Amino acid sequence: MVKIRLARFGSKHNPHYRIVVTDARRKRDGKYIEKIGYYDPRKTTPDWLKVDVERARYWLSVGAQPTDTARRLLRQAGVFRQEA
Amino acid sequence: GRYIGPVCRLCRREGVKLYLKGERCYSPKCAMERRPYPPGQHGQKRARRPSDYAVRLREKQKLRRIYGISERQFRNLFEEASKKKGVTGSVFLGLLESRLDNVVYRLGFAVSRRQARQLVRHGHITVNGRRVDLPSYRVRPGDEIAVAEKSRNLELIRQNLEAMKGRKVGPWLSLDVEGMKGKFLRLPDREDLALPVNEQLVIEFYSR
Amino acid sequence: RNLSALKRHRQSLKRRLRNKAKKSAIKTLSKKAVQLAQEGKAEEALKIMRKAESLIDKAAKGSTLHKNAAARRKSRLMRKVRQLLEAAGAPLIGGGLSA
Amino acid sequence: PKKVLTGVVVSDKMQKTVTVLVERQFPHPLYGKVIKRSKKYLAHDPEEKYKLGDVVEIIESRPISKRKRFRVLRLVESGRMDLVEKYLIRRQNYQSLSKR
RNA sequence: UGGAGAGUUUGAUCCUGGCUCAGGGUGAACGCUGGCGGCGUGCCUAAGACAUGCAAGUCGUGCGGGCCGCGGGGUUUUACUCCGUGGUCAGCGGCGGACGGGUGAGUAACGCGUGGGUGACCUACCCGGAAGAGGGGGACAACCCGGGGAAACUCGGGCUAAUCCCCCAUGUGGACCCGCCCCUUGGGGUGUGUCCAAAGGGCUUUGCCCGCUUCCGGAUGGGCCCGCGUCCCAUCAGCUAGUUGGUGGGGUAAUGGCCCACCAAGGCGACGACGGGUAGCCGGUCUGAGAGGAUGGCCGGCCACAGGGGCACUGAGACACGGGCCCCACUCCUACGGGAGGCAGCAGUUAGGAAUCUUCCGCAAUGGGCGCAAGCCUGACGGAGCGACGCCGCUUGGAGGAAGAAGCCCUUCGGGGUGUAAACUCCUGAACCCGGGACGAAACCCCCGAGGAGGGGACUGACGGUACCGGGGUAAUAGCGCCGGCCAACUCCGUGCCAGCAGCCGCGGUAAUACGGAGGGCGCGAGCGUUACCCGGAUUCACUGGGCGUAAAGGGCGUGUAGGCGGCCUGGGGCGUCCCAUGUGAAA
């Protein structure tokens, strides 16, 4: 199965995650498929909100799953939201 | 670590003096005037034929001596000159002087380069806001480099203020005697602010 | 010292028991089929065929001759059965057999 | 994009199986000039519709057998010989190199 | 937007031509010196051995239990049975243990890189959609009795369970066979005859949830194959009997001789087979004018392996690091009857070696396991530690201060040099106390709305009272190499082919700018040099970029096989060749 999740690429104490689709079985800091996000839980510069709205929506459609703080960042990205 | 010691012993080593120790190394001697010519035993024997490369090398030394730094970082940033495009050595001299210590110098804040390094490193000099340490901190076209809150309350600060007046700024270093500040501007060159070292020689020697 | 791969071991042993026994059953039934077939009488070989194919998708049912090999051996069985039938025999009794 | 090769059929030697003498051009990723080299693939001819020399077009196929890959499809031109002829001569001259 | 050379064979010159150096680079190591910090990186040799510690579990929304315990339910009570019920531990049971992780031994291979084929295939774990959950019945644990063993733990009869094992039914659909239909390598619809299903839990309980059975589709992964690219020895020239091919079967998920039967003799090679030597390939990295040369730690992709070799079972997935069996080798345990272990997982130990780390902290983040969740495991991972080990940042002070002290070296004894250097004068404030002080974390969870989309409510820090901010405040480690040409830096003693130096030329045979020492200078600066190792220079394997009259070098001449390479007109073809449009060339 496939999962969407957070992969760090920051310095020895400079965290910074990317939100990306990968078939779970792949390792943390490894290859993926669709570069569909990034986000920094430290709020470096006001750009810490990145999710590929379209194909993330369509990804959760095709039968994919997210992670924890991924649910968080999508309940902020609103890709979850239908607007109501 | 900036040699430290017999400094204007190089004021004579290069041959011609430089604004080095400040008031004195500009007063009736940078150790010059009195007797300018390289020290040592062979002090004045009968100057030989400096191989062409060595004229070049002595120029490199010369320039990095006036600029007050070891040639390590100097090397790295000369490479940064090669990379950051422009007629290499020119925009090199520029992106050399853009360094905060001597920005503080020619801005008329510090009397001498060493003194400058002290002042800046102790955050006596602030840069567009935060009291930036690091003598090696290049600024940008627009930034206003000031001093510290406890500097208007500092001494040889007011010395510098009063005794400097009647001296015009490096045409981009827009100071303040009114508030002790100073805007950064355009990139100066060989002629905006000149000095006694032929740049082409320096670059040609360096990258060999 | 210990683990849960002792549990995995013993389990694997039971699963192997059922697997082995059933697969063997399939093999023998098939052999019966060819016996009465190269003979030349459909009848009992039709009974054998029913039993066989059922056990075949009993193999597909779980972790034995999964999907193909089950079906593949259905094919090959009925095939090798059928050919020898019309050879000295009237292919009758519509069982696991079309026409 | 099932790769297909245009080549001179060599030796009907086997039944339902033909050897095919392909030859490709190439540059020289160091010296510029062009080069050329022959490759013998496994033409699948289940009814000997091919024979001595006749160039046919061969196909990237299901693994027909042991190295026996590369079926056929469209026959091209017959009455070739001459080519297969020269190749043959070269073969005999391979058996013209001995240290024994 | 990037490219320089000099030393060196002669009495002397030009050309030729090797040895040398200037250079950048390193997981380095060695002697000399060595302060704070960031980020990094740190067994390259023994794929030798490894003691200890940890590293794979989890679920009671799968099912019967022994044992600590409470109401003590029955006991009119007893002695203690037993409805309920908080907690431990095994079992059957279900998913994980085929991910994660370490290593370069093998492997010159379709392994890898790479572009595709699969009308030849496999794919549990989450989304789509249709079809669905009739009944009966069986086995073995745990546990009951008895025994043997040092331990490893072991045998026999006896017990009840279930999403555990089954048989008939229910059959959209699926599978086979035989037949038609379009397709055209087994693609797809379809007719007759047989076979295949299903398992129940939890409650807020009459309705929802978690799991279910069947097929079609999605998602991703993966096997199979193919074109091309992928190192030296031709003093390795012939290689071969499953070998080459078929037809017919086994086996596989399927293709294929991978395997068997049988039958036909091909299969391959100087375009460099077969064989020996050597190495995991790579995105790239360092060098380089460029082409090229080397190489592949860390990081990422793909391989293959667990002390060496063979094997199979389980399972959607493996010949399975920390699962089993076997053989050999090896240590290790015991009362000697007989046994256990595999750290090329994390630390650490040991030998090898000139060389390379704490038997540490946190599950607070991310990612993985399983669970309705609560939750637990998590040496993946997140961090502190030790090494100047590399890049970078920084400090050992800043201002005036002498026709210039003292000391020390040179002298033609007038002085010159170290030297603004010093002491002092003031200014600051490395270090270091007092105080305050973090970001790194909003979800899952609780309620409003239904558990749906949306709102509020609430727990969550290892790092560390560290980064950081405020006040206060002390002048406070500087060394290494060079100084004959290359090459910036010279005088003085001692030494007298002795002592020595040395990268090449050479330097010492009693006036040495080379040896030691001393003054002074060059360079570099928490660095300095040495050796090693690769690329450069080296246009010294020359493709941009070379040569063979006498310098290295034209075959003793012919002959002609293959190959290479070809005059001039026309048009067709469009193969190389150029262009046009996209897929791809992941990230870094």
PDB file of C-alpha atoms (C1' of nucleotides) in Angstrom, chain E residues 112-218:
ATOM      1  C1'   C E 112      24.060  -2.235 -12.826  1.00  0.00           C
ATOM      2  C1'   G E 113      23.091   1.996 -15.749  1.00  0.00           C
ATOM      3  C1'   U E 114      19.681   2.659 -19.461  1.00  0.00           C
ATOM      4  C1'   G E 115      15.263   2.650 -23.410  1.00  0.00           C
ATOM      5  C1'   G E 116      11.389  -0.300 -23.831  1.00  0.00           C
ATOM      6  C1'   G E 117       8.353  -4.971 -24.351  1.00  0.00           C
ATOM      7  C1'   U E 118       4.879  -8.691 -20.946  1.00  0.00           C
ATOM      8  C1'   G E 119      -1.347 -10.613 -26.786  1.00  0.00           C
ATOM      9  C1'   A E 120       3.281 -14.758 -21.128  1.00  0.00           C
ATOM     10  C1'   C E 121       2.716 -12.718 -15.489  1.00  0.00           C
ATOM     11  C1'   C E 122       2.429 -11.870  -9.674  1.00  0.00           C
ATOM     12  C1'   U E 123       0.646  -7.894  -5.929  1.00  0.00           C
ATOM     13  C1'   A E 124      -2.033  -9.177   1.274  1.00  0.00           C
ATOM     14  C1'   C E 125      -1.711  -4.210   3.549  1.00  0.00           C
ATOM     15  C1'   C E 126      -5.712   1.529   2.072  1.00  0.00           C
ATOM     16  C1'   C E 127     -10.180   4.060  -2.272  1.00  0.00           C
ATOM     17  C1'   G E 128     -14.196   2.449  -6.216  1.00  0.00           C
ATOM     18  C1'   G E 129     -18.221  -0.626  -7.553  1.00  0.00           C
ATOM     19  C1'   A E 130     -21.943  -4.915  -8.031  1.00  0.00           C
ATOM     20  C1'   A E 131     -23.003  -9.842  -5.606  1.00  0.00           C
ATOM     21  C1'   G E 132     -23.396 -11.319  -0.520  1.00  0.00           C
ATOM     22  C1'   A E 133     -23.080 -13.877   5.931  1.00  0.00           C
ATOM     23  C1'   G E 134     -28.591 -21.336   5.546  1.00  0.00           C
ATOM     24  C1'   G E 135     -26.844 -25.350   8.903  1.00  0.00           C
ATOM     25  C1'   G E 136     -24.380 -29.171  10.918  1.00  0.00           C
ATOM     26  C1'   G E 137     -20.031 -31.099  12.540  1.00  0.00           C
ATOM     27  C1'   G E 138     -14.387 -32.049  14.108  1.00  0.00           C
ATOM     28  C1'   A E 139      -9.081 -31.547  16.084  1.00  0.00           C
ATOM     29  C1'   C E 140      -5.357 -29.928  19.329  1.00  0.00           C
ATOM     30  C1'   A E 141      -3.213 -26.717  22.925  1.00  0.00           C
ATOM     31  C1'   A E 142      -3.667 -24.171  27.729  1.00  0.00           C
ATOM     32  C1'   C E 143      -5.119 -27.078  31.464  1.00  0.00           C
ATOM     33  C1'   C E 144      -5.667 -33.002  34.490  1.00  0.00           C
ATOM     34  C1'   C E 145      -2.688 -37.479  36.239  1.00  0.00           C
ATOM     35  C1'   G E 146       2.203 -39.950  36.094  1.00  0.00           C
ATOM     36  C1'   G E 147       7.128 -40.104  34.839  1.00  0.00           C
ATOM     37  C1'   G E 148      12.821 -38.747  33.088  1.00  0.00           C
ATOM     38  C1'   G E 149      16.571 -34.319  32.580  1.00  0.00           C
ATOM     39  C1'   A E 150      22.410 -30.558  34.843  1.00  0.00           C
ATOM     40  C1'   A E 151      20.518 -27.578  31.387  1.00  0.00           C
ATOM     41  C1'   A E 152      18.544 -28.119  26.643  1.00  0.00           C
ATOM     42  C1'   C E 153      13.531 -29.352  28.718  1.00  0.00           C
ATOM     43  C1'   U E 154      10.923 -34.299  26.944  1.00  0.00           C
ATOM     44  C1'   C E 155       7.373 -38.741  26.154  1.00  0.00           C
ATOM     45  C1'   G E 156       2.567 -41.116  27.097  1.00  0.00           C
ATOM     46  C1'   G E 157      -2.776 -41.474  28.078  1.00  0.00           C
ATOM     47  C1'   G E 158      -7.005 -37.257  29.314  1.00  0.00           C
ATOM     48  C1'   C E 159      -9.513 -32.343  28.539  1.00  0.00           C
ATOM     49  C1'   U E 160     -13.253 -27.514  26.438  1.00  0.00           C
ATOM     50  C1'   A E 161     -13.144 -23.305  23.420  1.00  0.00           C
ATOM     51  C1'   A E 162     -13.388 -20.019  19.062  1.00  0.00           C
ATOM     52  C1'   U E 163     -12.795 -15.201  12.966  1.00  0.00           C
ATOM     53  C1'   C E 164      -9.360 -22.826  14.559  1.00  0.00           C
ATOM     54  C1'   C E 165     -10.345 -27.169  10.679  1.00  0.00           C
ATOM     55  C1'   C E 166     -13.970 -28.679   7.837  1.00  0.00           C
ATOM     56  C1'   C E 167     -18.995 -30.970   4.197  1.00  0.00           C
ATOM     57  C1'   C E 168     -23.920 -30.053   1.506  1.00  0.00           C
ATOM     58  C1'   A E 169     -26.427 -25.751   0.281  1.00  0.00           C
ATOM     59  C1'   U E 170     -26.832 -19.953  -1.526  1.00  0.00           C
ATOM     60  C1'   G E 171     -23.641 -18.504  -6.995  1.00  0.00           C
ATOM     61  C1'   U E 172     -23.699 -11.840  -9.659  1.00  0.00           C
ATOM     62  C1'   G E 173     -19.344 -13.390 -10.843  1.00  0.00           C
ATOM     63  C1'   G E 174     -15.134 -16.675 -11.463  1.00  0.00           C
ATOM     64  C1'   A E 175     -12.173 -21.558 -13.323  1.00  0.00           C
ATOM     65  C1'   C E 176     -11.633 -25.510 -16.549  1.00  0.00           C
ATOM     66  C1'   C E 177     -12.788 -28.218 -20.787  1.00  0.00           C
ATOM     67  C1'   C E 178     -15.413 -28.611 -25.741  1.00  0.00           C
ATOM     68  C1'   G E 179     -17.914 -24.928 -29.477  1.00  0.00           C
ATOM     69  C1'   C E 180     -19.092 -19.799 -32.054  1.00  0.00           C
ATOM     70  C1'   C E 181     -17.763 -14.570 -32.375  1.00  0.00           C
ATOM     71  C1'   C E 182     -14.425 -10.201 -33.291  1.00  0.00           C
ATOM     72  C1'   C E 183      -9.267  -9.708 -32.076  1.00  0.00           C
ATOM     73  C1'   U E 184      -4.452 -11.654 -33.672  1.00  0.00           C
ATOM     74  C1'   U E 185       1.520 -14.995 -29.548  1.00  0.00           C
ATOM     75  C1'   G E 186      -2.783 -16.931 -23.969  1.00  0.00           C
ATOM     76  C1'   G E 187      -6.564  -9.951 -26.248  1.00  0.00           C
ATOM     77  C1'   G E 188     -12.371 -10.185 -25.338  1.00  0.00           C
ATOM     78  C1'   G E 189     -17.724 -11.466 -25.471  1.00  0.00           C
ATOM     79  C1'   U E 190     -20.293 -15.900 -25.526  1.00  0.00           C
ATOM     80  C1'   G E 191     -23.472 -21.427 -25.784  1.00  0.00           C
ATOM     81  C1'   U E 192     -23.816 -26.585 -23.324  1.00  0.00           C
ATOM     82  C1'   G E 193     -21.653 -29.925 -18.444  1.00  0.00           C
ATOM     83  C1'   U E 194     -18.991 -29.786 -13.443  1.00  0.00           C
ATOM     84  C1'   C E 195     -16.400 -27.247  -9.489  1.00  0.00           C
ATOM     85  C1'   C E 196     -15.469 -22.406  -5.818  1.00  0.00           C
ATOM     86  C1'   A E 197     -17.584 -18.685  -1.564  1.00  0.00           C
ATOM     87  C1'   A E 198     -18.360 -16.610   3.238  1.00  0.00           C
ATOM     88  C1'   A E 199     -16.428 -15.588  10.179  1.00  0.00           C
ATOM     89  C1'   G E 200     -18.090 -13.547  13.286  1.00  0.00           C
ATOM     90  C1'   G E 201     -17.007  -9.271  17.204  1.00  0.00           C
ATOM     91  C1'   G E 202     -18.097  -4.544  19.852  1.00  0.00           C
ATOM     92  C1'   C E 203     -21.554  -1.319  21.671  1.00  0.00           C
ATOM     93  C1'   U E 204     -24.000   4.689  22.323  1.00  0.00           C
ATOM     94  C1'   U E 205     -27.922  -2.228  20.818  1.00  0.00           C
ATOM     95  C1'   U E 206     -32.673  -2.425  16.793  1.00  0.00           C
ATOM     96  C1'   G E 207     -29.246   0.861  14.265  1.00  0.00           C
ATOM     97  C1'   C E 208     -24.164   2.021  13.625  1.00  0.00           C
ATOM     98  C1'   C E 209     -19.086   0.374  13.558  1.00  0.00           C
ATOM     99  C1'   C E 210     -14.433  -3.321  12.839  1.00  0.00           C
ATOM    100  C1'   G E 211     -13.523  -7.558  10.373  1.00  0.00           C
ATOM    101  C1'   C E 212     -16.135 -10.979   6.136  1.00  0.00           C
ATOM    102  C1'   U E 213     -16.992 -13.756   1.239  1.00  0.00           C
ATOM    103  C1'   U E 214     -16.648 -13.108  -4.808  1.00  0.00           C
ATOM    104  C1'   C E 215     -15.308 -10.841  -8.953  1.00  0.00           C
ATOM    105  C1'   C E 216     -14.028  -6.503 -11.851  1.00  0.00           C
ATOM    106  C1'   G E 217     -11.177  -1.897 -11.338  1.00  0.00           C
ATOM    107  C1'   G E 218      -7.676   1.500  -8.831  1.00  0.00           C
TER     108        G E 218
END
